[PDB]
Write an enzyme that holds these catalytic residues in place. Structure first.
Site, PDB file in Angstrom:
ATOM      1  N   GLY A 150      31.650 -27.416 -28.552  1.00  0.00           N
ATOM      2  CA  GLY A 150      32.726 -26.446 -28.531  1.00  0.00           C
ATOM      3  C   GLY A 150      34.067 -27.003 -28.942  1.00  0.00           C
ATOM      4  O   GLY A 150      34.146 -27.746 -29.928  1.00  0.00           O
ATOM      5  N   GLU A 151      35.121 -26.652 -28.200  1.00  0.00           N
ATOM      6  CA  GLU A 151      36.477 -27.087 -28.524  1.00  0.00           C
ATOM      7  C   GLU A 151      36.577 -28.606 -28.539  1.00  0.00           C
ATOM      8  O   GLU A 151      36.273 -29.261 -27.541  1.00  0.00           O
ATOM      9  CB  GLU A 151      37.459 -26.486 -27.512  1.00  0.00           C
ATOM     10  CG  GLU A 151      38.583 -27.409 -27.060  1.00  0.00           C
ATOM     11  CD  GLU A 151      39.735 -27.499 -28.045  1.00  0.00           C
ATOM     12  OE1 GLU A 151      39.501 -27.438 -29.280  1.00  0.00           O
ATOM     13  OE2 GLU A 151      40.886 -27.595 -27.571  1.00  0.00           O
ATOM     14  N   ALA A 152      37.032 -29.156 -29.669  1.00  0.00           N
ATOM     15  CA  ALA A 152      36.976 -30.599 -29.886  1.00  0.00           C
ATOM     16  C   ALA A 152      37.684 -31.391 -28.798  1.00  0.00           C
ATOM     17  O   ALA A 152      37.223 -32.473 -28.423  1.00  0.00           O
ATOM     18  CB  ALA A 152      37.566 -30.943 -31.244  1.00  0.00           C
ATOM     19  N   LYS A 160      37.650 -30.696 -25.741  1.00  0.00           N
ATOM     20  CA  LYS A 160      36.749 -30.714 -24.585  1.00  0.00           C
ATOM     21  C   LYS A 160      35.599 -31.686 -24.818  1.00  0.00           C
ATOM     22  O   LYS A 160      35.268 -32.502 -23.948  1.00  0.00           O
ATOM     23  CB  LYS A 160      36.217 -29.301 -24.318  1.00  0.00           C
ATOM     24  CG  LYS A 160      35.103 -29.203 -23.312  1.00  0.00           C
ATOM     25  CD  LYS A 160      34.539 -27.797 -23.285  1.00  0.00           C
ATOM     26  CE  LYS A 160      33.418 -27.605 -24.295  1.00  0.00           C
ATOM     27  NZ  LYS A 160      32.148 -28.256 -23.834  1.00  0.00           N
TER      28      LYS A 160
END
Ligand SMILES: Cc1ccc2c(c1[N+](=O)[O-])C(=O)C[C@@H](C(F)(F)F)O2
Length: 350
Positions: free
Chosen positions: A101-103, A105
């Site tokens: 997901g969000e880099a 994270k």
């Protein structure tokens, strides 16, 4: 005690967690469902059902808050990566936390995982010119796993053995990573995908695959949990009679939505359903009705604006009606306290 209200607030905590992890942990703590220590939350997150794997990863993956950092350190410190190759360790890590997901994270999860790996295998790190290469290689494995086992990427555009190798060229402080090292990873990932354990969402995904038509609506959101399946018969007019099998509808009750469907195609342990309509539980009331023509009637109503009649059913037998209407009525209560809590925006608008 195993109190109805008590239980109902546990689940309300979990729902807050699966929407706003920071808020859900506060909620569970302020009621003594989980201790106010990083260790206690750690064991909760990785042990308790009802928690979405995506948001366990969004919570632990938060690097700003020191509590969130502290819980991720407790999580990795409870995993044993000794004698393992970096992919074999990732398989174990990705088993509890969805890493994707969000880099920012995925960076903080991989950062915390790699540090733990270095501590469990100091002989592996000594083989590297730069220890940070372990982070780059870890991230690479995640990305390979995503692509190799992505349905949107057709085999021809998929990353092949030398694509993988070519991408990790000259990253170990100028030098390549040993080709036989990267080739073992690729074959091990190729032999079986790094999968995350199933949660309540993966049950909602199965259902949602079986239902054609939808108004969206995704249905498989993190907070949404399958509660109950039931076969009832829609009653268009509760004042007119109708044939005992007419209008048969299969009902899926989720913890915040009631979905009404009809069977599309039946076969040997393989059924599809045509989506007909779904109702929100906010403002719903559940009424029972018994008359000349229907002995196990159910009438559903929307008090929110004058009162609206949503739908009338008749169940096969009064036991089904009592199981269905009790489950639906507690979900409706669960949803009422969710908004009663959600009108906290008075403390957000100063
Ligand atoms: C188009 C369609 C297909 C099947 C249906 C219905 C409808 N529809 O006309 O909406 C119903 O209303 C009830 C029900 C029954 F078959 F039992 F009559 O199943």
């Amino acid at each position: 005690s195993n109190d109805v209200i008590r239980k109902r607030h546990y689940r309300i905590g979990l729902n807050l967690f699966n929407k706003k992890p920071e808020k859900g942990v506060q909620y569970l703590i302020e009621r003594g469902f989980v201790p106010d220590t990083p260790v206690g939350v750690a064991h909760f997150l990785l042990q308790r059902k009802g928690l979405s794997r995506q948001m366990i990863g969004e919570f632990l993956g938060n690097r700003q808050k020191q509590f969130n950092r502290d819980v991720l350190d407790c999580v990795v410190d409870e995993m044993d990566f000794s004698t393992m190759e970096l992919d074999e360790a990732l398989r174990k890590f990705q088993a509890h936390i969805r890493v994707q997901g969000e880099a920012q994270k995925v960076e903080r999860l991989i950062e915390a995982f790699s540090q733990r790996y270095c501590i469990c295998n100091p002989g592996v790190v000594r083989q590297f010119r730069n220890p940070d290469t372990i982070f780059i290689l870890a991230f690479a494995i995640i990305l390979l796993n995503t692509d190799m086992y992505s349905p949107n990427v057709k085999p021809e555009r998929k990353m092949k053995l030398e694509d993988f190798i070519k991408n990790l060229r000259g990253v170990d402080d100028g030098e390549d990573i040993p080709r036989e090292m990267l080739m073992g990873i690729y074959e091990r990932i190729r032999k079986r995908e790094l999968k995350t354990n199933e949660d309540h969402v993966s049950q909602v995904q199965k259902v949602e695959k079986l239902i054609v038509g939808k108004k969206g609506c995704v249905l498989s959101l993190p907070h949404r949990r399958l509660v109950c399946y039931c076969r009832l018969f829609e009653v268009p007019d509760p004042n007119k009679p109708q044939k005992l099998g007419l209008h048969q509808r299969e009902i899926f009750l989720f913890n915040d939505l009631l979905v009404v469907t009809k069977i599309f195609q039946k076969k040997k342990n393989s059924v599809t359903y045509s989506f007909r309509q779904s109702f929100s539980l906010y403002g719903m009331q559940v009424l029972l009705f018994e008359n000349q023509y229907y002995p196990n009637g159910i009438r559903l109503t929307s008090s929110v604006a004058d009162i609206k009649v949503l739908i009338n059913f008749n169940a096969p037998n009064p036991q089904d009606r009592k199981k269905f209407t009790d489950d639906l009525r507690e979900s409706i209560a669960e949803v009422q306290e969710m908004e009663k809590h959600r009108i906290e925006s008075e403390l957000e608008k100063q």
